[PDB]
Amino acid sequence: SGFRKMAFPSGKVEGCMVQVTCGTTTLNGLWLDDVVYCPRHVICTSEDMLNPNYEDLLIRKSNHNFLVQAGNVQLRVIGHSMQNCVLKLKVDTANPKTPKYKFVRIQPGQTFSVLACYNGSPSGVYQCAMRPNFTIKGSFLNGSCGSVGFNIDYDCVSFCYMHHMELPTGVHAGTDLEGNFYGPFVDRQTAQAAGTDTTITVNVLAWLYAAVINGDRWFLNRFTTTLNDFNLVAMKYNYEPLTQDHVDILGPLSAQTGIAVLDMCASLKELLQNGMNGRTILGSALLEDEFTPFDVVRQCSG
Amino acid sequence: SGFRKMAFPSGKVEGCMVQVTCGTTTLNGLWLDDVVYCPRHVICTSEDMLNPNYEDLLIRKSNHNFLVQAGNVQLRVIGHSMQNCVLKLKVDTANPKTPKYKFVRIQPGQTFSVLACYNGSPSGVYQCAMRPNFTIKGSFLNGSCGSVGFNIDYDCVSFCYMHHMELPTGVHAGTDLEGNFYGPFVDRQTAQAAGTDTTITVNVLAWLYAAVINGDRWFLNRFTTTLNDFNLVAMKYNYEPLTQDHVDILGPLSAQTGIAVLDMCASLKELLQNGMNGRTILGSALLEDEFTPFDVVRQCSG
Numbered sequence A, B: 001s002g003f004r005k006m007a008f009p010s011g012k013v014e015g016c017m018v019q020v021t022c023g024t025t026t027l028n029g030l031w032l033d034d035v036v037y038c039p040r041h042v043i044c045t046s047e048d049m050l051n052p053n054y055e056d057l058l059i060r061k062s063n064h065n066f067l068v069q070a071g072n073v074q075l076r077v078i079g080h081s082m083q084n085c086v087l088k089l090k091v092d093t094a095n096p097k098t099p100k101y102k103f104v105r106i107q108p109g110q111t112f113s114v115l116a117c118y119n120g121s122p123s124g125v126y127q128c129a130m131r132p133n134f135t136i137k138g139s140f141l142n143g144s145c146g147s148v149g150f151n152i153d154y155d156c157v158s159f160c161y162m163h164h165m166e167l168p169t170g171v172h173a174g175t176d177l178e179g180n181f182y183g184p185f186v187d188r189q190t191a192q193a194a195g196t197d198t199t200i201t202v203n204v205l206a207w208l209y210a211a212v213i214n215g216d217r218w219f220l221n222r223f224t225t226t227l228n229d230f231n232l233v234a235m236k237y238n239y240e241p242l243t244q245d246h247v248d249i250l251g252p253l254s255a256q257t258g259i260a261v262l263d264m265c266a267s268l269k270e271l272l273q274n275g276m277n278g279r280t281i282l283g284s285a286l287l288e289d290e291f292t293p294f295d296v297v298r299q300c301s302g
């Protein structure tokens, strides 16, 4: 029993973190096979950041302008190219610690683990979700650019996020491992703000199932609701629409607990309208939305 | 910016996890140098668990009764001994992935990362605290025994917890890596209950400093309090006493934010008496107590 915000073991990713320096900018890179992936803004100076033309800035660089360090050893850069907002540095050595990996671009609502790094050294691991407004609520300081987010599927590391920036509200923006930003953000130091965020409804329902699996049932009720009437209440509280596909994905949890999805929706509706009345669910006084249905099944079934 | 429940990168510990089987009981072991450490209850049967005499049960075992598997390879057991509630199995191979390590017995209020494992395979990592009642609020299923808790200090892994059991309230009990239980618990399937828990006051204050460092200041006030008057209010809310040593440990955070410890105590007193009035601190509607002052400095300073 128990339910924690649980990250994937980070070992397979720790064995891929390197330091990348270009001029006075040092950040992290991801070394897989003979390629090091990092944010392309590693080529910028403070003046360039305001409005950079990355194609020009990269044309002015050579392989020797990039210093890649894997622990105590230097990896010679033998080639370079830009793919969207990432820079790919071909190196002379294939990483012997390269795990089985994939690059995936996730959807909002999906969770992942972040391995926060500084100077190519892993510092900590935590669990995030891609918010509906395409930001992540991470914990990143200057030097963390190039830190990655990932999921582990059996023995395959699926990389889904690379860190690039912090928005004025303290939330974070970045790209997939092919350098495409999540959301409308751009890698330039200019006025950008996250849109209004919403609650990931399917994940709140998944976490209410986790609470039931763990013996927290106080919020359950005899009522059911229709998907339409639930969505009418959900919109009012800035919750994402619950779809029939979401109801289907919650099927296994619904069957394991004997509580139909629309029955759980009536509990969520009652919680949204009345609050918790001084009570907690899984040690939280707020409705948690950063566990997917898969995270709940994984953690509760091992 | 940002503040998350952050675990240490688990790689160094993942490289030490093995599976240990004795009869039909399979659990996890920790392989460091040529020794595998695991819960001694691996030698018990369901009938033995009610009231075992471990000295007898171990005398009846031989090295060949223990099956140690490190991934796909079998590690031959060449010796065995019991130290408190842990079993130490000497094996024919020294772990080539043995990090720089120490075994430490932590105090209540200290935090650590748990690498949850099943059949010698790491499943997830999360952050815990040793509660004042000597339990941990973990997330563990059957098969997780032998999973360890640790801190990483520079390049040294300090192991502090090995998982053994779950109490009726859903919280967890275990030992240090030398097999001494935290708290009054014993490794036998009999009536045991955790005592009433309290809030780790020094950690709540550390997290209020983390909130200020991250721009959350709504709870601050112009008042100060005395250590005695704060402790009089703290006892009323089941909070641990705040000591002068705690006030000293919070010194660096107090100096970085310009808010004296007793000034922050007046904020905590006001929060305990009035509540949050619909507001949150670092995304929480409860006062968090599972970040130590060191965790805050580490995460906020990188």
Ligand SMILES: *[C@](O)(C(=O)NC)[C@H](CCC(C)(F)F)NC(=O)[C@@H]1[C@H]2CCC[C@H]2CN1C(=O)[C@@H](NC(=O)OC)C(C)(C)C
Residues within 6 Å of the ligand: A025, A026, A027, A041, A049, A140, A141, A142, A143, A144, A145, A146, A164, A165, A166, A167, A168, A172, A186, A187, A188, A189, A190, A191, A192, A193, B001
């Ligand atoms: C990152 O480049 C790094 O770690 N380099 C050593 C750095 C990470 C900062 C933080 C707080 F998120 F960890 N990112 C930046 O400084 C980025 C940089 C690349 C893309 C634009 C350029 C500015 N920038 C920012 O994060 C700025 N934010 C915005 O411009 O938001 C619209 C600030 C420096 C935070 C104002």
Ligand SMILES: *[C@](O)(C(=O)NC)[C@H](CCC(C)(F)F)NC(=O)[C@@H]1[C@H]2CCC[C@H]2CN1C(=O)[C@@H](NC(=O)OC)C(C)(C)C
Residues within 6 Å of the ligand: A001, B025, B026, B027, B041, B049, B140, B141, B142, B143, B144, B145, B146, B164, B165, B166, B167, B168, B172, B186, B187, B188, B189, B190, B191, B192, B193
């Ligand atoms: C652990 O032995 C294991 O993973 N083995 C394969 C197991 C872990 C259970 C859990 C839920 F915490 F992950 N631990 C036990 O089953 C222990 C076992 C060793 C010490 C006593 C004996 C019973 N036990 C318990 O956890 C029981 N709890 C108590 O007896 O609490 C007083 C239950 C089986 C949970 C009732």
